[PDB]
Design a protein around this ligand. Structure first.
Ligand SMILES: Nc1ncnc2c1ncn2[C@@H]1O[C@H](COP(=O)(O)OP(=O)(O)NP(=O)(O)O)[C@@H](O)[C@H]1O
Ligand SMILES: Nc1ncnc2c1ncn2[C@@H]1O[C@H](COP(=O)(O)OP(=O)(O)NP(=O)(O)O)[C@@H](O)[C@H]1O
Ligand SMILES: Nc1ncnc2c1ncn2[C@@H]1O[C@H](COP(=O)(O)OP(=O)(O)NP(=O)(O)O)[C@@H](O)[C@H]1O
Ligand SMILES: [K+]
Ligand SMILES: [K+]
Ligand SMILES: [K+]
Ligand SMILES: [Mg+2]
Ligand SMILES: [Mg+2]
Ligand SMILES: [Mg+2]
Lengths: 333, 333, 333
């Protein structure tokens, strides 16, 4: 007999997802928010704010409420929470609700406590904080309860997260701030250096998605980009090829492969054998980079699987974990 | 339930247009006014005053009430507003009316406030001031609400106005006092230098319209002009060709192309890509100069469209914006 | 509802014309008056006095009441006004009448005021003074209201009047005292120098009318003149040819063409173009000089029309202007 609503949230640096027990996933939009600096009014958020990135008047302020699991703008976080459930024809579901949040391993206890405080402020009565790595593992269809080791690589917009999981525990974890946003910056840096053209972030992210890859793929294809020539200052277009972008990504993943090496270096020997057999599981947005699994196999010789629907791994995991959370509540935890 | 009349106005330096909700465009005449200097009586305005330019006794004073969106003659502005609706068989529609005015980006807050004060003086209760660039964009059939960048070039009689528009906002704007009047002066300067003939403004404007162009066109044709020989002081005629006038306009547009370059130089890179794809939109009277679109394409390589009915873009935009203004009034703005 | 009579007057230096509303032109005779110097009695006026010019006893005094629009003899003017309407079987129509007078541009405000005073003295209640040039333009069938420029050349007995007219206004005006009387004097001067014969004015005026011309015409014809030989003092006749007289007129019109040149030199350039297209209109008595239009065309290359019935242009114009004057009276002007 549970009368209270169950809410889970994936408050990622790039995409925010919200789940309501009984309704399903009720929100899944970019995390960007647009404020007016002269008046501090919330102009837009989600897709509406994402379409404006780089095309906005100088009075508009683009905000990311959460950066790497840390509330970066208190008021923006509060505004986003007051909106995710605004398209649900119901009174506030935050009231005395059970809230399950997922945090990267890098988040601090104080920052975790600040997360709970914002949820309680909305009206929740119980606020549980789970490890993102095990939520993602669950979402990818891994039975984390088993005494079997798995290597999870969660590539998001702000951070790349590495976790050795086994018996539902994170035995080893590493995190680095080289992810989707870092890849975009480097794509932008390269195009500037090579073609003397200044492109926006939105354009950098679109070539990443449209031709980005780590190993040659079955539909190699070029792309036309449009930016501002650094010399003339006028609009200028250029043709970008798959090879060039593959080399940019290979350069940026050099630091991620180094984190994997360090992670394995601190992994208990008996868990190392499981890694040889169970391999790597890649999830998050970065799991969509073409042939990222072939890349990891070539370098490490470990089996590498891309989680199906890798953008939803975390939120999908919170849905699986709902049963566990309601069994614990029934046990007084 | 709106009982108050809706009035919008395009108070251009050359042509004044007035719109009444329910009646349509109710006034569209030149902005010139004719006063008697010995008595200060309003002799004529609109077409009647325009036909007299350069043919009037020395006691007559030609007045332009608004020059570049700035009330230049307070009393003349007041007289014009008391006349636009004089051919409407109705009592004053200014009473407690909703008035929508459009201003060039160069107008100052104080001058904008002076505009509202004149409208309130007539009897209006609500006086809204919109950007001319977005009214013109609307008039040209652009969905300014979309997160897509457009370059608007508004060539009038007093000013050329450049605006980068996107998401219903003016992200970048530049304005220059090189427009129809400047072109006429230069046509007059050229004919004096080349043929030693002093022509009036009316004659300068008519050759601009009758053979003026920026690129060779499908009906190249000469024109006979009539002026006063600077040496003999007697009447003298001359034959003016398309080529000569094209070269005069090409010289004057050199400064407009420089403003476009500066505008693009201060345009965010991601908006520059949209400009490459959406191109330029030319409106205003100057949009009628022959092959002005071919001119802009040749120089910048950007798609260039001439707004259909480019003299009515602004007023047509105020009509489209009426719905938005009445939704805001319903929301207490 | 107008109960008051309407009177208009053309008080020319040579011919006086009077118009009564409802009756038409009621008087049209030479302006000469004959007084007895020993008794100051009015002997004759009009045609009767004109037939006596040069044939009168030494006690008779020939008077011109108005010379160039200026009352030259106060009593003679008063006598003429008491006679123009003497052949109308009605009581004084001057009583509380509306009087429209026409003045050359050279007349002074004081002289204009003296004109009104004489009319009021007769019994008029309203005395309007119009420009002769626009009355003549009207009489010649020009729509002076239009914003189109016309060059009017009014050649009378005392003055030649030049006016640029447009929008019912005299934009530029010049006047010279070289007209019919000056031509007669020069005809008399020539015949004296060439044939040693002293002719009277009447004879000078008759050869001007009978063979006078400015360009060779289709019925070149000689004339027999009769005067007093300067040597013998006895009567002597001589044969005068068309050529000789044409050369005399060409010499006298040299000063009129100079006035036209000066007029055009002070004409606004945009009005100069209209002059090229609308041309010159010649009216007054001097418009009857043969081929005066061919003369003006040859010298200036401007279209030149002779007003039909050029002696009646002014009075005919006052008749057209009657409607305007009665609309103004209805408006309290
Ligand atoms: N097809 C694709 N190819 C490459 N990158 C992609 C693709 N689709 C999305 N991305 C990137 O994946 C990221 C979004 O993944 P996501 O898992 O939602 O990150 P996040 O959880 O919101 N941020 P984080 O807090 O670091 O986990 C963005 O940087 C996207 O640019
Ligand atoms: N066919 C044409 N070819 C060239 N110029 C033209 C043509 N028709 C009109 N114009 C000019 O266009 C101008 C009028 O355009 P318009 O948009 O009405 O300006 P405006 O709004 O009244 N003045 P502004 O306040 O500067 O915008 C005048 O300078 C005209 O001479
Ligand atoms: N056929 C003709 N050829 C030449 N001159 C003529 C002819 N008929 C009349 N005239 C002259 O024309 C003059 C009369 O014209 P008119 O328009 O009546 O002058 P006016 O108005 O009376 N004088 P003014 O006050 O100067 O305008 C006289 O000088 C006549 O000699
Ligand atoms: K996410
Ligand atoms: K206008
Ligand atoms: K006369
Ligand atoms: Mg994530
Ligand atoms: Mg305009
Ligand atoms: Mg006269």
């Amino acid at each position: 007999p549970e009368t209270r609503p169950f809410i889970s949230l994936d408050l990622g640096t790039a995409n925010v997802l919200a789940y309501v027990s009984g309704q399903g996933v009720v929100y899944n939009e970019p995390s960007l928010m647009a404020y007016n600096n002269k008046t501090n009014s919330l102009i837009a958020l989600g897709k509406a704010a994402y379409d404006m990135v780089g095309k906005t008047h100088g009075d508009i302020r683009m905000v990311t409420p959460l950066v790497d699991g840390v509330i970066a703008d208190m008021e923006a976080a509060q505004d986003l929470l007051k909106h995710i459930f605004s398209r649900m024809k119901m009174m506030n579901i935050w009231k005395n609700a059970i809230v399950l949040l997922a945090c990267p391993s890098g988040v601090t206890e104080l920052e975790r406590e600040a997360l709970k405080n914002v949820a309680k402020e909305m009206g929740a009565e119980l606020v549980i904080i789970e490890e993102e790595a095990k939520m993602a593992a669950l979402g990818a269809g891994i039975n984390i309860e088993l005494p079997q080791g798995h290597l999870i690589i969660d590539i998001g917009g702000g951070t790349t997260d590495l976790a050795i999981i086994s018996s539902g525990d994170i035995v080893v974890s590493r995190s680095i701030k080289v992810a989707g946003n870092h890849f975009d910056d480097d794509i932008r840096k390269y195009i500037r250096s090579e073609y003397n053209i200044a492109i926006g972030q939105k354009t950098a992210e679109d070539v990443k998605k449209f031709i980005g890859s780590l190993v040659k793929y079955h539909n190699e294809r070029s792309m036309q980009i449009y930016g501002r020539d650094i010399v003339s200052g006028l609009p200028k277009e250029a043709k970008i090829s798959s090879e060039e972008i593959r080399n940019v990504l290979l350069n940026a993943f050099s630091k991620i492969t180094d984190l994997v090496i360090e992670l394995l270096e601190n992994t208990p020997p008996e868990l190392a054998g499981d890694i040889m057999r169970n391999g790597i599981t890649v999830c998050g947005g970065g799991a969509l980079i073409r042939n990222i699994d072939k890349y990891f196999f070539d370098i490490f010789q470990l089996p590498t699987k891309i989680a199906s629907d890798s953008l939803n791994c975390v939120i999908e995991g919170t849905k699986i974990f709902e049963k566990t959370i309601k069994k614990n509540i029934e046990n007084g935890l």
